[PDB]
Amino acid sequence: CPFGEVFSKFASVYAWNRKRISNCFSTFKCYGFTNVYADSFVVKGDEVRQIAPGQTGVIADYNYKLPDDFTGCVIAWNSVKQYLYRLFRKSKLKPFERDISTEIYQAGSTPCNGQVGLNCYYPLERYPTTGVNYQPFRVVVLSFELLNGPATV
Amino acid sequence: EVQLVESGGGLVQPGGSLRLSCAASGITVSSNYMNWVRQAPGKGLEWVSLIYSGGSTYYADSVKGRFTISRDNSKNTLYLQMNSLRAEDTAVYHCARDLVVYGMDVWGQGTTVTVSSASTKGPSVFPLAPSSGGTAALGCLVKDYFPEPVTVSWNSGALTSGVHTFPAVLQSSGLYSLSSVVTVPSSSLGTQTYICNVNHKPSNTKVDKRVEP
Amino acid sequence: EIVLTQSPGTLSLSPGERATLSCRASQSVSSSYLAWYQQKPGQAPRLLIYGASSRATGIPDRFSGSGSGTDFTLTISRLEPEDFAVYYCQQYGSSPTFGQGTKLEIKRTVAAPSVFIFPPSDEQLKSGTASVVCLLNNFYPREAKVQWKVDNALQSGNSQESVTEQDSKDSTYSLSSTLTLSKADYEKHKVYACEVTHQGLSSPVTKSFNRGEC
């Protein structure tokens, strides 16, 4: 079980990683197997609460969403050794949806044609000795899958 | 083209309801973070409501359970439904485009909302006569009127120098009141005619009251 | 939540000087969520600095942002005559919040007020109420103390004040305080006075009149 492989380089919240696990901390809240999924990304301490059913916010709507029927748990520890997040998006993200596109966000009537400027902004915004709330908090989420078939855990 | 226009403000009795309209041109309401920021008379900017591009709506503690913000894709108009309007809500409401990291760059002139039980009434004008080579002060007292505003002129606009028209103050009775004054030479008290002109459209009141020793 | 405090309430300088605007955050906060706004009278707020020191498009370079952590500074290197307005600082968190604002006035030499006291008009008394108006004309600074005294008794809770904006010519202020009393209360007393305390007066100036005497 490569649980030590999950906990040098991490991925941003907008590009969160999921890993297929089979046949094997400041915040720890459980809510709820054939399959278990390891979600690893990073958000600041303010947005840790976004990883929960019944959520609203920049991370919840446009970066990472929980299915409101979560049968799993959320793991996270303190300040991070070594980050992007999606700020501009037209619609809310679906549960477990991942958005990679870097297309210029069109906030006006005229289109952008890939050029940043008036009413045309990059959807992704860049994230020591500051408030720990705004310091990165690595977040690990485990999703449990249970269907009518042989289990693998 | 990039502009925000507010409309729908008016007079509402306490505990009533009112809806505001923020028509947008050049920018898309549904694609931007929309904010409502109001300003009480003589006070600072106070944030009211926030709607996300994805539909999430945020509200302040003082407006929770009372205010609701919506939008119309077909009209590109931002709405704000207000309920249980207390005296705190007497303010001018603006709608602004919110770039979260980059701040609020586009602001509208706003619309005025007043919460008061008082009905429209005509102002009462009372002269402030001077009393006995020098400078003397005289004026008019515009008392017990509602609602704003009132326009005061002296000698049909002929006299402007030395004129001080003070901002109105809401009295404990719910009716506005202010004073307008002017400083004139004492030698001209008996030879120059000083008339103050007071106008009030809502109550159909237009009065010319003259001040004499 | 986030609370922003701006110091001081009023900044008084002259054109060509340097303005240091202070906004205090009660908690450590992000350096990318702060915005400085300029609001002239009768106009919508105008964004000047976003983030911490980034100027908005079309903002003159004389405006400069600075500060980090809990203290932030807005700097105008050379004050133009049209830079005098009210300046606000903003923070977001989850819901945007604003400070109370700082007013930029024009520095001026001290000017003592002209104090005039107006007895209530006879025509007003026929309505059953009496208003006594005290006038403070063309003074600076705005800090003026007006105390109503009926038969030497300090009146409190029955007076209202209103101050005009800074004059475009001499940069002075005018104040008008109204003492509202009923007809019965007005006739109950004789001496009505208005004591004014200001920086331009060596001693407080009292303008008084006796009721029913002209």
| Structural domains of chain C, with CATH | 4-106 (2.60.40.10), 114-210 (2.60.40.10)
**DSSP letter (8 states) at residue B84:** S
> Are B197 and B111 part of one and the same domain?
no
> Are B83 and B150 part of one and the same domain?
no
Name the neighbours of C, counting chains with at least 3 Cβ pairs within 8 A: A, B
> Are B111 and B136 part of one and the same domain?
no
Number of cross-chain residue pairs from A and B with Cβ atoms under 8 Å apart? 48
> Are A2 and A56 part of one and the same domain?
yes
Q: What is the CA radius of gyration of chain C?
A: 23
- Do the Cβ atoms of A119 and B2 come within 8 Å? yes
- Do the Cβ atoms of B141 and C124 come within 8 Å? yes
Domain boundary among B65, B85, B115: B115
Domain boundary among B91, B115, B139: B115
Name the minimum distance, in Å, from the CA of B138 to any CA of chain A. 55
> Are B154 and B188 part of one and the same domain?
yes
Number of domains in chain B: 2
> Are A145 and A70 part of one and the same domain?
yes
Chain B residues with CB under 8 Å of A87 CB are 100-101
**For residue C123, how far is the Cα from the chain centroid?**
33
Q: Assign residue B26 a region (left: φ > 0; alpha: ψ between -120 and 50; beta: otherwise).
A: left
> Are A47 and A101 part of one and the same domain?
no
> Are A98 and A24 part of one and the same domain?
no
Given CB atoms, is C95 within the 8 Å cutoff of chain A? no
Cα(C71)–Cα(C27) distance, integer angstroms = 10
Q: Which residue has the tokens 């760059």?
A: B105
Q: Which residue has the tokens 């926030």?
A: B50
Cα(C15)–Cα(C6) distance, integer angstroms = 22
> Are A93 and A147 part of one and the same domain?
no
Specify which residues C146 forms β-bridges with. C196
Residue A100: φ, ψ to 5°? -110, -25
> Are B139 and B94 part of one and the same domain?
no
| Out of A46, A57, A130, closest to residue C28 by CB | A130
Q: Which residue has the tokens 């009295």?
A: B171
Q: In Å, what is the CA distance from C54 to each residue of B91, C31, C57, C58?
A: 31, 11, 10, 12
Q: The tokens of A95 are what?
A: 């549960």
Write out the DSSP string of C121-158.
Answer: PHHHHTTTEEEEEEEEEEEBSS-EEEEEEETTEEE-SS
Cα(B29)–Cα(B76) distance, integer angstroms = 6
Q: The tokens of A131 are what?
A: 């408030």
- Among residues B168, B171, B13, the alpha carbon closest in space to that of B89 is found at B13
> Are A16 and A30 part of one and the same domain?
yes
Secondary structure element (H or E) that encloses residue A58, with its range = helix A58-62
| Out of C47, C92, C101, closest to residue B44 by CB | C101
Cα(C46)–Cα(B139) distance, integer angstroms = 37
Range of the domain at B199: 124-211
> Are B109 and B182 part of one and the same domain?
no
> Are B105 and B144 part of one and the same domain?
no
CATH number at residue B165: 2.60.40.10
Q: Mutating which of B1, B52, B76, B101 best tests the A interface, going by the most A Cβ atoms within 10 A?
A: B52
Is the CB of residue B139 less than 8 Å from the CB of residue B182? yes
Is the CB of residue A76 less than 8 Å from the CB of residue A48? yes
Q: Which amino acid is at B57?
A: T
Q: Mutating which of B34, B49, B56, B106 best tests the A interface, going by the most A Cβ atoms within 10 A?
A: B56
Is the CB of residue A129 less than 8 Å from the CB of residue A40? no
Residues 6+ apart with CB under 8 A from B43: B91
Secondary structure element (H or E) that encloses residue A62, with its range = helix A58-62
- Do the Cβ atoms of B27 and A90 come within 8 Å? no
Q: The tokens of B100 are what?
A: 């979260």
| Out of C29, C30, C94, closest to residue A57 by CB | C94
**For residue B159, how far is the Cα from the chain centroid?**
26
- Strand locations in B13-63, DSSP E? 18-25, 33-39, 45-51, 57-59
> Are A65 and A78 part of one and the same domain?
yes
> Are A35 and A110 part of one and the same domain?
no
* Chain A residue nearest residue C56, CA to CA: A118
Q: Which residue has the tokens 């045309």?
A: A120
Secondary structure element (H or E) that encloses residue A3, with its range = helix A3-6
Is the CB of residue B26 less than 8 Å from the CB of residue B3? yes
Q: The tokens of C153 are what?
A: 């008794």
Cα(C2)–Cα(C95) distance, integer angstroms = 9
Residues 2-31 of C with CB under 8 A from B: none
State the burial class of residue A106 (Cβ atoms within 10 Å of its Cβ: 0-12, 13-18, 19+): middle
> Are A138 and A67 part of one and the same domain?
yes
> Are A76 and A88 part of one and the same domain?
no
- Among residues A125, C137, C162, C87, the alpha carbon closest in space to that of B181 is found at C137
CA angle C24, C25, C30 (to 5 degrees): 125
> Are A60 and A113 part of one and the same domain?
no
| Out of B107, B127, B131, closest to residue C45 by CB | B107
Range of the domain at A13: 1-82+128-153
Q: Assign residue B105 a region (left: φ > 0; alpha: ψ between -120 and 50; beta: otherwise).
A: alpha
Sign of the CA dihedral with C44 first, then C138, B167, and B210 last:
negative
CB atoms within 10 A of CB B143: 22
Q: Which residue has the tokens 């003492």?
A: C179
Q: Report the number of secondary-structure helices (H) and strands (E) in chain A.
A: 2, 9
Residue B82: φ, ψ to 5°? -115, 135
Is the CB of residue C197 less than 8 Å from the CB of residue C158? no
Number of domains in chain A: 2
Method: X-ray
- Strand locations in chain B, DSSP E? 3-7, 11-12, 18-25, 33-39, 45-51, 57-59, 67-72, 77-82, 91-99, 103-107, 111-115, 124-128, 135-145, 151-154, 163-165, 169-170, 176-185, 194-200, 205-211
Residues 6+ apart with CB under 8 A from C39: B45, C45, C46, C85, C86, C87, C88, C101
State the alpha helices, DSSP H only, in B48-187. Answer: none
Q: The tokens of B44 are what?
A: 């600072």
Q: Which amino acid is at B173?
A: S
Q: Mutating which of B63, B166, B212 best tests the C interface, going by the most C Cβ atoms within 10 A?
A: B166
Coil/strand/helix, residue A55? coil
Domain boundary among B81, B115, B149: B115
Coil/strand/helix, residue C99? coil
Q: Does a cis peptide bond (omega within 30 degrees of 0) precede residue C141? A: yes
Cα(B158)–Cα(B166) distance, integer angstroms = 19
Q: Which amino acid is at A112?
A: C
Q: Could you report how far apart the first and last alpha carbons of chain B are, in Å? A: 57
Given CB atoms, is C65 within the 8 Å cutoff of chain B? no
- Among residues B24, B134, B139, the alpha carbon closest in space to that of B73 is found at B24
Q: Could you report how far apart the first and last alpha carbons of chain A are, in Å? A: 10
Listed as own residue / partner, the contacts of A143-146 with beta carbons closer than 8 Å and 24 or more positions apart are A143/A18, A143/A36, A143/A37, A143/A39, A143/A70, A143/A71, A143/A72, A143/A96, A144/A32, A144/A33, A144/A35, A144/A36, A144/A37, A144/A71, A144/A72, A145/A33, A145/A34, A145/A35, A145/A36, A145/A37, A146/A33, A146/A34, A146/A71
